[PDB]
Amino acid sequence: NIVTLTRFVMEEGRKARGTGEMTQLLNSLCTAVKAISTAVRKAGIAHLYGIAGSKKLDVLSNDLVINVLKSSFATCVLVSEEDKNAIIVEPEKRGKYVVCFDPLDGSSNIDCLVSIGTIFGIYRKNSTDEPSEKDALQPGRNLVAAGYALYGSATMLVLAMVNGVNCFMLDPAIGEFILVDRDVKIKKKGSIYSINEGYAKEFDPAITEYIQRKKFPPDNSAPYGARYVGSMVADVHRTLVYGGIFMYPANKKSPKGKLRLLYECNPMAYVMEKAGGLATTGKEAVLDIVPTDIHQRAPIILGSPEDVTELLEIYQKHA
Amino acid sequence: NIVTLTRFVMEEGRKARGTGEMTQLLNSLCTAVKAISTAVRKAGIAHLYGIAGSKKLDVLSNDLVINVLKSSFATCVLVSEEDKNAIIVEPEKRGKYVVCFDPLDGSSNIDCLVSIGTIFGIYRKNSTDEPSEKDALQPGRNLVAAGYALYGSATMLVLAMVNGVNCFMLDPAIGEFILVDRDVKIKKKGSIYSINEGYAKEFDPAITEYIQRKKFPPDNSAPYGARYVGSMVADVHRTLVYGGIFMYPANKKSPKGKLRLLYECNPMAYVMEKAGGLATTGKEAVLDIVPTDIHQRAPIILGSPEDVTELLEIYQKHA
Amino acid sequence: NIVTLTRFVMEEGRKARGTGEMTQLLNSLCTAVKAISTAVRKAGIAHLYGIAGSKKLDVLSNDLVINVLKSSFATCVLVSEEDKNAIIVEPEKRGKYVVCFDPLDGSSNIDCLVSIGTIFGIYRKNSTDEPSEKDALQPGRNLVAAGYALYGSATMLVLAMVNGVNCFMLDPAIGEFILVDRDVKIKKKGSIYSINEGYAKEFDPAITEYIQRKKFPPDNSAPYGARYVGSMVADVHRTLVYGGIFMYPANKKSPKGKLRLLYECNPMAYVMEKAGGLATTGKEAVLDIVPTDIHQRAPIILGSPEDVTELLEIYQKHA
Amino acid sequence: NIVTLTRFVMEEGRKARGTGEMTQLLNSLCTAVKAISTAVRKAGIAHLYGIAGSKKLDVLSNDLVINVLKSSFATCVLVSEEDKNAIIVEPEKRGKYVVCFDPLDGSSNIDCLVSIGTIFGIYRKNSTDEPSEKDALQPGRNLVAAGYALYGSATMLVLAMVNGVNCFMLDPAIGEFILVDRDVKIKKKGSIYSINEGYAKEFDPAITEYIQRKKFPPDNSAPYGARYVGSMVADVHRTLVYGGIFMYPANKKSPKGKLRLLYECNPMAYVMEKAGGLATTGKEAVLDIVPTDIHQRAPIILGSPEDVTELLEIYQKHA
Numbered sequence A, B, C, D: 001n002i003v004t005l006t007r008f009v010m011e012e013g014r015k016a017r018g019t020g021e022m023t024q025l026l027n028s029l030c031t032a033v034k035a036i037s038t039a040v041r042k043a044g045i046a047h048l049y050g051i052a053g054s055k056k057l058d059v060l061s062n063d064l065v066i067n068v069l070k071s072s073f074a075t076c077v078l079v080s081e082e083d084k085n086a087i088i089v090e091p092e093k094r095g096k097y098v099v100c101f102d103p104l105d106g107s108s109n110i111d112c113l114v115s116i117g118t119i120f121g122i123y124r125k126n127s128t129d130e131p132s133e134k135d136a137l138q139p140g141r142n143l144v145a146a147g148y149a150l151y152g153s154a155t156m157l158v159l160a161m162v163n164g165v166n167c168f169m170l171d172p173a174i175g176e177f178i179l180v181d182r183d184v185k186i187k188k189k190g191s192i193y194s195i196n197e198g199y200a201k202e203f204d205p206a207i208t209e210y211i212q213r214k215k216f217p218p219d220n221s222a223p224y225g226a227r228y229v230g231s232m233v234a235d236v237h238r239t240l241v242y243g244g245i246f247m248y249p250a251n252k253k254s255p256k257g258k259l260r261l262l263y264e265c266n267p268m269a270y271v272m273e274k275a276g277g278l279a280t281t282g283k284e285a286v287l288d289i290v291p292t293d294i295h296q297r298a299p300i301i302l303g304s305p306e307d308v309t310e311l312l313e314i315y316q317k318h319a
């Protein structure tokens, strides 16, 4: 039997005996992602170019996520990469979930048709205080659900929750995601490393050494191949699906790293851990950082455990 | 006024006073590419997964190109990356054009949702001999038309002919490509370099030196950023659209390079030259190589002229 | 706030405090209908016509409904117009719902591109006996849910449940139904009558008289217009949405009428009553017939109450 | 070999040795019709209903036809049901063709999801005068091409030209029409008659008699079935494809009939004659009427020759 995402979410919801609030939240997200995907793939562009005489994607994207999420009646605080402040949802529309998201990531690559994606993280609100931005400032270890949709050759939604990681391909003919990979586990050790080497001159010494190992294995094994798409979601997904390592460590231009903690790193740290991989800054597990700002950045190295561990040891060694 | 690809091909055809054979050829290709794109984006996958109880993409892809091209009644010799021998078309279906193509490229990246593409090159048959594979063995300088379709965030067809390079976005809602960039010119000098550094230990000395320049500019300018998707069509298109350099030089694993001369390098060499860029092996212009085998490989460095020229000078210097 | 069908079903489910079984059932149906719609509108037909070298719609249709419904884990007995016997679902896949449906209706009109549709009725299984066909033999008054999807200019799903009738337009771009008409009420009296007059010579005398009234109003009011598409779902939907009357009374060729009781008449009788209209055979309310065979037929007159009542009075008068 | 509409138009163009102007015209139309079809089937409606916070179909429809047709550079005078005056195209955009069209017909049926369609007729401009509305006032016998697209269960384009009638199904997955019926011939005699009987009290005496024959065959043959969708394009297409007769004769409300001569009747008269059928007002062949106003109406009876002839004889008899 074929399993759609809507059924998958619904059975899981039933299993956990939820009141169905989170299920509605997940149904919404899932709707939002289909709307973004159709917009990404440029359906209807001929209208912009005057086919009948007569918004930018990342703005449209953000607006779909915000409106559809408010529509779920399941959230109370949203954080979007696109908005300077946490969005507090209106009382009449308020539920218990806090959702951090990046509506459209890798848009420095929309002119180039580069694979892009949406990243989401979902927290339960615990405090009884009138909902506020501090509700977003929870370490990633407290995620209830997290994943991303990727708009690449095809569109996939990957959703990690307490019980594993699942990939659902979008069948754009019928507007339905199809379970295709169940209980996904990253391989222990990979063959690909993924970093922007253009920063070779700002790299710290453990990264420099690690890059040399990959190219000239001190033990005379096969050198890793290199891949760097420049879309976190594209690169992380290849990592998840094929193994290897993905790095965005701190550099002089970005001394606390470049990627964002709340709505890029953490979600991906979460998918990686439930898939058996690791996600570190080099000094600490990503998921254990207690954030202090909703747009805080962090360095991140993630992927196959043996690989991330080999780099951690090099950071350790450079005491 | 909006301009579709079908109208663009047709006006150009009219302008050149063609008998309309090449126009039919280009209309077919354009159809084929839409069929591949819908298959790439996985429409109808739910059927494979048993939505109603009850082929691989690159095989499907190849079959669409062959059948649609035969359908144009405009070709006599096809070369596909997927077929060991040139396909000679049947007399009743025979026209004057020779088409070299790669039906689906970067499929080592379909499990990973990596952007993939189709690359085509079109030659006129000149000899009067019964059509044969030697009809494919023409230096790329003799191309009449060439381009690629990219299946990335969105689908684009790029078509270069004697009079410039044009990009047409696919609007999947109505099955129509829309002219979006006219007369495209690569910038003289870029900021991105694109190579698989995992081969750092097989690289020849001009490549090694060039990579160091990009990372540590001897003149203290800004270091290039690195991008490597691992799909020739994705990487070349970013190059075309944003400038920079793309390299696949020879290595010990691949001593004559890896990419294919007839249906990957040449088409891209052609798009690059009509867009004002360069495409060299390091010793000679790609388009001037007289091929001797339909699956011959060549090293290729291509992109922005100042950039390719800086590398050529380093090859020259290492006399 | 926009309301999708998935959210609508889910909130209603929550409201009724269901265990979510019926919700899964309704989610499935809703999926099935999108798959049928894409097949109806002929996506992918080029493959049948050899675009890459190398089932009938109503068979495909039936198979989608059966497989997707089994997939819901919510049903135990299915009745399809297409299957001679009730389908008993397997124990491991068994739930409490009995679903009578017509997978694709008005296919005598697929060669002609006539609007066609899917009709469904859902009963709860009450008896404790090992599920069997008698579980389908429930008067329509016991329906829990019922409606149809129409594949006409656009695709609409209409769903009637205890609390009213709702119409959801399919947005085929994102595979999502959008609530567009809430709590739909048929108008008391209409201006259109819908019957196949080609049977004028078999018509009983109350129908003959009623047809004359519509054309030559004995009171000198405006004569009704006539519409007869020949697709029950098309004609009933126009009735629902614009008012008037729809008739398929008994004739010599079909002495108990032509339409089917379990999976055409009853569902439509149910939509009509919750929308404020009537559905009679001429002697009794359709919804009160206790069926004795799963493929039993019945005469049906349905639509706006004043209109159906005017015809009932004529049947009464012809004592 | 599969045949797309674009190839079909192009080969025919080649065969007739056209300069390719009409080919561009037909390519445009074909594009326009795909844009209308996607709009009809309501892709993107969720945007109207606020999926991201934040025109009517027949207006949109009209605008697509006008802009795409101007885009062909092939026309000089357009007549649309929607515009009070002929549209004269601008000199820089001017070609030789006159196109009469009805952008979206049967919209009195968009609330009801009734099958609707677009009807077009194409004339060559013969006079040398500065193009004007009299260029539209040509009897239908002078058509060069004519047909309609139908938005019904699926979308079909039917195109009649001097050499026969051809039907092309739209495959919405790839935005391509597929030849499915070649050289279509209506059957000599049919079994269906199609008229709005609600006008029984205004009908002239030959229509009244003809209707009685269909229901009570004076020769004791089988009575015709009745079908009346209320969309000219739906009813005419069923007629073409299944045979029978379609009538919209004059009534007191509409003493010169209701349908329009330039952009409904004539095109359909033309398709019918090239398919072997007839199209009469009852006194004269539709195609031979010399129109005097661009929005002139005419009575029309059309379909299978034996059938139209049986009605003509009854009009003759009622001397």
Ligand SMILES: Nc1ncnc2c1ncn2[C@@H]1O[C@H](COP(=O)(O)O)[C@@H](O)[C@H]1O
Residues within 6 Å of the ligand: A009, A010, A012, A013, A014, A016, A017, A018, A019, A020, A021, A022, A023, A026, A096, A124, A144, A161
């Ligand atoms: N659809 C679902 N899938 C997986 N887990 C869920 C789902 N719904 C609820 N849960 C678990 O049950 C908790 C409470 O559910 P709720 O009543 O929906 O807020 C959630 O925070 C999850 O831990």
Ligand SMILES: Nc1ncnc2c1ncn2[C@@H]1O[C@H](COP(=O)(O)O)[C@@H](O)[C@H]1O
Residues within 6 Å of the ligand: B009, B010, B012, B013, B014, B016, B017, B018, B019, B020, B021, B022, B023, B026, B096, B124, B144, B161
């Ligand atoms: N559609 C077209 N676009 C651009 N150039 C064309 C086109 N059709 C023909 N040409 C030029 O005219 C030559 C002969 O055309 P043909 O008669 O189509 O083989 C082609 O090889 C091209 O050089």
Ligand SMILES: Nc1ncnc2c1ncn2[C@@H]1O[C@H](COP(=O)(O)O)[C@@H](O)[C@H]1O
Residues within 6 Å of the ligand: C009, C010, C012, C013, C014, C016, C017, C018, C019, C020, C021, C022, C023, C026, C096, C124, C144, C161
């Ligand atoms: N999604 C729903 N929409 C409307 N009514 C429902 C829904 N789910 C359940 N109900 C009502 O609750 C009953 C039991 O629900 P269930 O536990 O899903 O079988 C159903 O038979 C309906 O009467």
Ligand SMILES: Nc1ncnc2c1ncn2[C@@H]1O[C@H](COP(=O)(O)O)[C@@H](O)[C@H]1O
Residues within 6 Å of the ligand: D009, D010, D012, D013, D014, D016, D017, D018, D019, D020, D021, D022, D023, D026, D096, D124, D144, D161
């Ligand atoms: N694509 C076509 N299909 C069928 N007939 C055509 C086509 N193109 C041209 N013709 C015939 O050739 C005439 C002149 O063509 P043109 O030069 O396109 O205006 C047209 O009016 C038609 O009679």
Ligand SMILES: O=P(O)(O)OC[C@H]1O[C@](O)(CO)[C@@H](O)[C@@H]1O
Residues within 6 Å of the ligand: A105, A106, A107, A108, A196, A230, A231, A232, A233, A258, A259, B225
């Ligand atoms: O150009 P850089 O510095 O290598 O940045 C690449 C990163 O930038 C982003 O687009 C911005 O978030 C990421 O998706 C991607 O990983």
Ligand SMILES: O=P(O)(O)OC[C@H]1O[C@](O)(CO)[C@@H](O)[C@@H]1O
Residues within 6 Å of the ligand: A225, B105, B106, B107, B108, B196, B230, B231, B232, B233, B258, B259
């Ligand atoms: O793994 P490598 O050796 O870097 O190869 C990448 C290249 O391989 C291909 O997929 C094979 O043609 C190209 O599209 C791409 O440029």
Ligand SMILES: O=P(O)(O)OC[C@H]1O[C@](O)(CO)[C@@H](O)[C@@H]1O
Residues within 6 Å of the ligand: C105, C106, C107, C108, C196, C230, C231, C232, C233, C258, C259, D225
């Ligand atoms: O040709 P008839 O006898 O008027 O039948 C029309 C009816 O037939 C069906 O196609 C068969 O169920 C109905 O949808 C429609 O109402």
Ligand SMILES: O=P(O)(O)OC[C@H]1O[C@](O)(CO)[C@@H](O)[C@@H]1O
Residues within 6 Å of the ligand: C225, D105, D106, D107, D108, D196, D230, D231, D232, D233, D258, D259
């Ligand atoms: O309601 P009536 O008078 O039967 O009109 C039906 C006709 O009206 C139109 O919608 C108006 O052109 C036609 O397509 C159709 O044949």
Ligand SMILES: *[C@@H]1CC(=O)N(CC)C1=O
Residues within 6 Å of the ligand: A108, A109, A110, A111, A112, A113, A114, A230, B192, B225, B227, B238, B242
């Ligand atoms: C496209 C445009 C751009 O600037 N890049 C990032 C290097 C792209 O991929």
Ligand SMILES: *[C@@H]1CC(=O)N(CC)C1=O
Residues within 6 Å of the ligand: A192, A225, A227, A238, A242, B108, B109, B110, B111, B112, B113, B114, B230
């Ligand atoms: C996906 C799968 C694979 O092996 N790679 C190439 C390194 C992918 O991108």
Ligand SMILES: *[C@@H]1CC(=O)N(CC)C1=O
Residues within 6 Å of the ligand: C108, C109, C110, C111, C112, C113, C114, C230, D192, D225, D227, D238, D242
């Ligand atoms: C199409 C084909 C057919 O026989 N009819 C029913 C009268 C159609 O509508």
Ligand SMILES: *[C@@H]1CC(=O)N(CC)C1=O
Residues within 6 Å of the ligand: C192, C225, C227, C238, C242, D108, D109, D110, D111, D112, D113, D114, D230
């Ligand atoms: C829909 C709405 C309307 O008034 N009718 C025409 C009788 C429809 O079909």
Ligand SMILES: [Mg+2]
Residues within 6 Å of the ligand: A081, A102, A104, A105, A106, A264
């Ligand atoms: Mg981001």
Ligand SMILES: [Mg+2]
Residues within 6 Å of the ligand: B081, B102, B104, B105, B106, B264
């Ligand atoms: Mg290749």
Ligand SMILES: [Mg+2]
Residues within 6 Å of the ligand: C081, C102, C104, C105, C106, C264
């Ligand atoms: Mg039926």
Ligand SMILES: [Mg+2]
Residues within 6 Å of the ligand: D081, D102, D104, D105, D106, D264
């Ligand atoms: Mg009209």
